[PDB]
Amino acid sequence: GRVGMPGVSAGGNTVLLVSNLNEEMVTPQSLFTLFGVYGDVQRVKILYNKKDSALIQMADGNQSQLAMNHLNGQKMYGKIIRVTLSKHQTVQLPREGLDDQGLTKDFGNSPLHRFKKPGSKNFQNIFPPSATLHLSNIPPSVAEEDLRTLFANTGGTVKAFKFFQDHKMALLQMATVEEAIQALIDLHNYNLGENHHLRVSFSKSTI
Protein backbone atom coordinates (compact mmCIF):
# COMPACT_ATOMS: atom_id res chain seq x y z
CA GLY A 1 0.00 0.00 0.00
CA ARG A 2 0.90 3.71 -0.10
CA VAL A 3 -1.91 5.32 1.95
CA GLY A 4 -3.58 4.87 5.36
CA MET A 5 -3.29 8.25 7.17
CA PRO A 6 -6.33 9.49 9.18
CA GLY A 7 -6.49 12.48 6.79
CA VAL A 8 -4.91 14.32 3.84
CA SER A 9 -4.04 17.87 2.68
CA ALA A 10 -7.67 18.51 1.61
CA GLY A 11 -9.77 16.15 3.76
CA GLY A 12 -11.01 13.13 1.76
CA ASN A 13 -13.54 15.09 -0.32
CA THR A 14 -12.33 14.22 -3.88
CA VAL A 15 -13.82 17.46 -5.28
CA LEU A 16 -12.57 20.83 -6.58
CA LEU A 17 -14.93 23.75 -7.28
CA VAL A 18 -14.24 26.32 -10.03
CA SER A 19 -15.74 29.65 -11.07
CA ASN A 20 -15.24 32.66 -13.36
CA LEU A 21 -15.20 30.36 -16.43
CA ASN A 22 -15.26 31.37 -20.12
CA GLU A 23 -17.84 28.71 -21.07
CA GLU A 24 -15.75 28.32 -24.28
CA MET A 25 -13.17 25.76 -23.06
CA VAL A 26 -14.37 24.85 -19.53
CA THR A 27 -16.55 21.89 -20.59
CA PRO A 28 -14.73 19.60 -23.07
CA GLN A 29 -11.53 17.60 -22.43
CA SER A 30 -9.61 20.89 -22.08
CA LEU A 31 -10.65 21.48 -18.45
CA PHE A 32 -10.22 17.78 -17.68
CA THR A 33 -6.65 17.79 -19.02
CA LEU A 34 -6.04 21.08 -17.14
CA PHE A 35 -6.68 19.45 -13.76
CA GLY A 36 -5.45 16.16 -15.28
CA VAL A 37 -2.02 17.72 -15.95
CA TYR A 38 -1.94 19.55 -12.61
CA GLY A 39 -2.54 16.21 -10.86
CA ASP A 40 -4.57 13.00 -10.62
CA VAL A 41 -8.26 13.38 -11.50
CA GLN A 42 -11.34 11.26 -10.76
CA ARG A 43 -14.18 13.11 -12.60
CA VAL A 44 -15.59 16.32 -14.14
CA LYS A 45 -18.89 18.29 -14.08
CA ILE A 46 -20.16 21.72 -15.24
CA LEU A 47 -22.97 24.03 -14.02
CA TYR A 48 -24.73 27.23 -15.13
CA ASN A 49 -27.72 27.51 -12.75
CA LYS A 50 -28.06 31.33 -12.44
CA LYS A 51 -24.22 31.43 -12.23
CA ASP A 52 -21.32 30.16 -14.36
CA SER A 53 -19.43 27.45 -12.43
CA ALA A 54 -17.98 23.95 -12.71
CA LEU A 55 -16.61 21.08 -10.64
CA ILE A 56 -13.78 18.57 -10.93
CA GLN A 57 -13.10 15.51 -8.75
CA MET A 58 -9.49 14.73 -7.86
CA ALA A 59 -7.27 12.78 -5.46
CA ASP A 60 -7.45 15.71 -2.95
CA GLY A 61 -4.21 14.96 -1.07
CA ASN A 62 -1.22 16.65 -2.76
CA GLN A 63 -2.40 18.05 -6.12
CA SER A 64 -5.88 19.56 -5.67
CA GLN A 65 -4.68 22.37 -3.36
CA LEU A 66 -1.68 23.03 -5.64
CA ALA A 67 -3.84 23.11 -8.77
CA MET A 68 -6.38 25.19 -6.81
CA ASN A 69 -3.87 27.88 -5.87
CA HIS A 70 -2.13 28.08 -9.26
CA LEU A 71 -5.30 27.99 -11.40
CA ASN A 72 -7.39 30.21 -9.05
CA GLY A 73 -6.08 33.23 -11.01
CA GLN A 74 -3.85 32.48 -14.01
CA LYS A 75 -5.84 34.08 -16.91
CA MET A 76 -4.31 31.55 -19.35
CA TYR A 77 -7.19 31.96 -21.86
CA GLY A 78 -9.01 35.21 -20.96
CA LYS A 79 -10.62 34.65 -17.54
CA ILE A 80 -9.60 34.57 -13.86
CA ILE A 81 -10.70 30.89 -13.75
CA ARG A 82 -11.45 31.16 -10.04
CA VAL A 83 -10.76 27.97 -8.04
CA THR A 84 -11.42 26.62 -4.52
CA LEU A 85 -11.83 23.30 -2.67
CA SER A 86 -15.53 22.37 -2.74
CA LYS A 87 -17.85 22.53 0.29
CA HIS A 88 -20.62 20.03 -0.56
CA GLN A 89 -21.25 16.31 -1.17
CA THR A 90 -19.52 14.41 -4.02
CA VAL A 91 -21.13 13.58 -7.37
CA GLN A 92 -22.98 10.26 -7.91
CA LEU A 93 -23.37 9.44 -11.67
CA PRO A 94 -25.41 6.20 -11.24
CA ARG A 95 -25.71 6.36 -15.06
CA GLU A 96 -23.11 5.23 -17.62
CA GLY A 97 -21.12 8.41 -16.83
CA LEU A 98 -23.17 11.38 -18.16
CA ASP A 99 -26.02 11.30 -15.60
CA ASP A 100 -28.31 10.96 -18.68
CA GLN A 101 -28.06 14.75 -19.07
CA GLY A 102 -24.49 15.69 -20.08
CA LEU A 103 -23.58 18.36 -17.48
CA THR A 104 -21.52 15.62 -15.77
CA LYS A 105 -18.42 13.89 -17.19
CA ASP A 106 -17.24 10.67 -15.49
CA PHE A 107 -14.17 10.87 -17.79
CA GLY A 108 -12.07 9.22 -15.02
CA ASN A 109 -11.21 6.50 -17.58
CA SER A 110 -8.43 8.95 -18.65
CA PRO A 111 -8.89 8.23 -22.40
CA LEU A 112 -6.21 10.90 -23.03
CA HIS A 113 -3.91 10.52 -20.00
CA ARG A 114 -1.58 8.03 -18.28
CA PHE A 115 -0.51 9.97 -15.15
CA LYS A 116 0.67 8.09 -12.03
CA LYS A 117 1.94 8.78 -8.49
CA PRO A 118 5.59 9.88 -7.99
CA GLY A 119 8.26 7.22 -8.58
CA SER A 120 8.74 7.38 -12.37
CA LYS A 121 8.40 10.04 -15.14
CA ASN A 122 7.50 12.46 -12.29
CA PHE A 123 8.85 13.36 -8.82
CA GLN A 124 6.63 16.31 -7.76
CA ASN A 125 3.13 14.70 -8.01
CA ILE A 126 2.18 17.55 -10.43
CA PHE A 127 3.68 19.26 -13.49
CA PRO A 128 4.70 22.96 -13.49
CA PRO A 129 4.05 24.91 -16.72
CA SER A 130 6.80 25.82 -19.23
CA ALA A 131 6.99 27.07 -22.84
CA THR A 132 7.96 23.51 -23.91
CA LEU A 133 5.40 20.77 -24.57
CA HIS A 134 6.49 17.10 -24.71
CA LEU A 135 4.17 14.37 -25.99
CA SER A 136 3.39 10.89 -27.24
CA ASN A 137 1.10 10.85 -30.31
CA ILE A 138 2.03 11.55 -33.95
CA PRO A 139 -0.58 9.84 -36.19
CA PRO A 140 -0.32 9.69 -40.02
CA SER A 141 -3.50 11.81 -40.40
CA VAL A 142 -2.29 14.87 -38.46
CA ALA A 143 1.25 16.23 -38.67
CA GLU A 144 2.73 19.72 -39.24
CA GLU A 145 0.17 20.06 -42.08
CA ASP A 146 -2.73 20.13 -39.58
CA LEU A 147 -0.80 20.92 -36.39
CA ARG A 148 -0.24 24.20 -38.25
CA THR A 149 -3.97 24.95 -38.03
CA LEU A 150 -4.05 23.78 -34.43
CA PHE A 151 -1.24 25.98 -33.07
CA ALA A 152 -2.47 28.74 -35.40
CA ASN A 153 -5.43 28.95 -32.98
CA THR A 154 -3.95 27.92 -29.58
CA GLY A 155 -2.55 31.30 -28.45
CA GLY A 156 1.08 31.63 -29.60
CA THR A 157 2.96 31.77 -32.92
CA VAL A 158 5.44 28.86 -32.92
CA LYS A 159 4.63 25.39 -31.42
CA ALA A 160 7.94 24.35 -32.91
CA PHE A 161 7.40 20.63 -33.43
CA LYS A 162 10.17 18.02 -33.22
CA PHE A 163 9.41 14.31 -33.52
CA PHE A 164 11.07 10.88 -33.42
CA GLN A 165 11.92 8.78 -36.50
CA ASP A 166 11.54 5.33 -34.89
CA HIS A 167 8.59 5.98 -32.53
CA LYS A 168 5.26 7.89 -32.40
CA MET A 169 6.21 10.71 -30.01
CA ALA A 170 7.42 14.32 -30.24
CA LEU A 171 7.55 17.74 -28.54
CA LEU A 172 6.27 21.31 -29.18
CA GLN A 173 7.43 24.85 -28.23
CA MET A 174 4.95 27.70 -27.70
CA ALA A 175 6.10 31.34 -27.63
CA THR A 176 5.24 31.71 -23.92
CA VAL A 177 4.36 29.53 -20.91
CA GLU A 178 0.79 30.79 -20.64
CA GLU A 179 -0.06 29.95 -24.24
CA ALA A 180 2.05 26.80 -23.74
CA ILE A 181 -0.18 25.47 -20.95
CA GLN A 182 -3.27 26.61 -22.80
CA ALA A 183 -1.95 25.26 -26.13
CA LEU A 184 -1.16 21.74 -24.96
CA ILE A 185 -4.49 21.85 -23.09
CA ASP A 186 -6.35 22.98 -26.23
CA LEU A 187 -4.74 20.32 -28.40
CA HIS A 188 -4.34 17.64 -25.65
CA ASN A 189 -7.25 15.81 -27.33
CA TYR A 190 -6.79 17.01 -30.94
CA ASN A 191 -5.16 14.57 -33.42
CA LEU A 192 -7.97 12.28 -34.66
CA GLY A 193 -5.61 9.32 -35.22
CA GLU A 194 -4.74 5.78 -34.10
CA ASN A 195 -2.67 7.19 -31.21
CA HIS A 196 -5.61 9.48 -30.25
CA HIS A 197 -3.33 11.68 -28.08
CA LEU A 198 -1.68 9.37 -25.57
CA ARG A 199 -0.56 12.67 -23.95
CA VAL A 200 1.09 16.15 -24.12
CA SER A 201 2.82 17.78 -21.13
CA PHE A 202 5.74 19.97 -20.01
CA SER A 203 9.46 19.10 -20.01
CA LYS A 204 12.82 20.62 -18.98
CA SER A 205 14.09 20.26 -22.56
CA THR A 206 13.72 22.85 -25.34
CA ILE A 207 13.34 23.24 -29.11
UniProtKB/Swiss-Prot annotation:
Residue ranges of domain RRM in the record: 14-88, 131-205
Record-annotated membrane-spanning stretches: none
Tissue-by-tissue expression: Mainly expressed in brain although also detected in other tissues like heart and skeletal muscle. Isoform 1 and isoform 2 are specifically expressed in neuronal tissues. Isoform 3 and isoform 4 are expressed in non-neuronal tissues. Isoform 5 and isoform 6 are truncated forms expressed in non-neuronal tissues.
Location of this chain's protein in the cell: Nucleus
Role, per record: RNA-binding protein which binds to intronic polypyrimidine tracts and mediates negative regulation of exons splicing. May antagonize in a tissue-specific manner the ability of NOVA1 to activate exon selection. In addition to its function in pre-mRNA splicing, plays also a role in the regulation of translation.
Oligomeric and partner information: Monomer. Interacts with NOVA1; the interaction is direct. Identified in a mRNP complex, at least composed of DHX9, DDX3X, ELAVL1, HNRNPU, IGF2BP1, ILF3, PABPC1, PCBP2, PTBP2, STAU1, STAU2, SYNCRIP and YBX1. Part of a ternary complex containing KHSRP and HNRPH1. Interacts with NOVA2; the interaction is direct.
Name by which UniProt lists this protein: Polypyrimidine tract-binding protein 2
Organism: Homo sapiens
Origin organism lineage: Eukaryota, Metazoa, Chordata, Craniata, Vertebrata
